Design a binder for this molecule. Structure first.
Ligand SMILES: CCOc1ccc(S(=O)(=O)Nc2cc(CC(=O)n3cccc3)c(NS(=O)(=O)c3ccc(OCC)cc3)c3ccccc23)cc1
Length: 285
């Protein structure tokens, strides 16, 4: 694609923002608000459309977890409701394989899901697939080699360094090598055939460390840390670089956006969001 979209988020309450960043010229676009505020949601893109999945409305009047799927068309600057999920999923992870959206884990009240469901845009229908081996909220999701990876999270009692791999053709999950660090609320993405896990919360502190998984060596290796510690950060890849957006550093809701260059193994700051926030959904189109 060519813009980095960021939807929703949290600062004092759940937010309705849809904004877009153009890395070519540094401009920020203010686009149509979400119809209902939400934080702890995920963003993805299928066929030029942006989707906002799951999350929760943390408001002064109450907190309501979201089963919603909403569809944003950049050509009309309009959000439309799509079919809701089987269950609300706050602190959800999502990935896309073959034009289908996978909604992974997340929470509904105190229920920590291990369930996974798959959306087909052509039918506007969700179906459950095989559940993960582990309940995971605050989970990161990456898609690599047409496999779906669920990384880290919190199972309701244990904060996780574990990760597992979903095989869509076989409809089954397998545990993979765990991370070096316990991480919930990390940003997880794929860049140049590796799975990156950036930031998160290890049970003691928000993290600035970043590690990556090589699927053939089956090993996780640390790379350069971020400039800021961040949990519930947004993450995406744009032109061979990772972008991380906002998150909570333990004290402030960050407006910082950093960019990771894999060739030089360096982070740098590229822009600031218009306001500090955490728990956003991010995608590129
Ligand atoms: C003063 C901070 O205020 C806020 C309010 C609201 C937010 S949010 O809108 O982004 N939603 C989220 C909250 C939490 C959890 C969280 O931080 N809070 C904060 C208030 C209530 C929950 C998560 N998981 S986590 O990062 O793994 C994590 C981090 C810290 C933890 O313990 C600290 C002792 C436990 C888990 C999340 C993971 C993914 C996506 C969203 C998350 C963020 C911060």
């Amino acid at each position: 694609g060519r813009l980095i979209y960021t939807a929703g988020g949290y600062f004092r309450q759940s937010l309705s923002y849809l904004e877009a960043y153009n890395p070519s010229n540094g401009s920020w676009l203010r686009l149509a608000d979400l119809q209902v505020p939400r934080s702890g949601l995920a963003g993805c893109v299928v066929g030029g459309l942006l989707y906002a999945v799951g999350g929760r409305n943390n408001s002064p009047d109450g907190n309501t977890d979201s089963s919603a799927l909403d569809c944003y068309n950049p050509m009309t600057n309009q959000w439309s409701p799509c079919a809701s999920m089987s269950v609300p999923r706050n602190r959800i992870g999502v990935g896309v394989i073959d034009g289908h959206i996978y909604a992974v884990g997340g929470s509904h009240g105190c229920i920590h899901h291990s369930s996974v469901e798959r959306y087909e845009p052509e039918r506007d229908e969700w179906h459950l697939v095989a559940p993960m081996l582990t309940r995971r909220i605050g989970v990161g999701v990456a898609v690599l080699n047409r496999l779906l990876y669920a990384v880290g999270g919190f199972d309701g009692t244990n904060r996780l360094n574990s990760a597992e791999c979903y095989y869509p053709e076989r409809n089954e999950w397998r545990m993979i090598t765990p991370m070096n660090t316990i991480r919930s609320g990390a940003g997880v993405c794929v860049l140049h055939n590796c799975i990156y896990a950036a930031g998160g919360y290890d049970g003691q502190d928000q993290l600035n460390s970043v590690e990556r998984y090589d699927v053939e060596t089956e090993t996780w290796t640390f790379v350069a840390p971020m400039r800021h510690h961040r949990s519930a950060l947004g993450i995406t890849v744009h032109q061979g670089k990772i972008y991380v957006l906002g998150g909570y550093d333990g004290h402030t809701f960050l407006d910082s956006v950093e960019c990771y260059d894999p060739d030089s193994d360096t982070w740098s700051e590229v822009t600031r969001m218009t306001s500090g926030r955490s728990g956003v959904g991010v995608a590129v189109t």
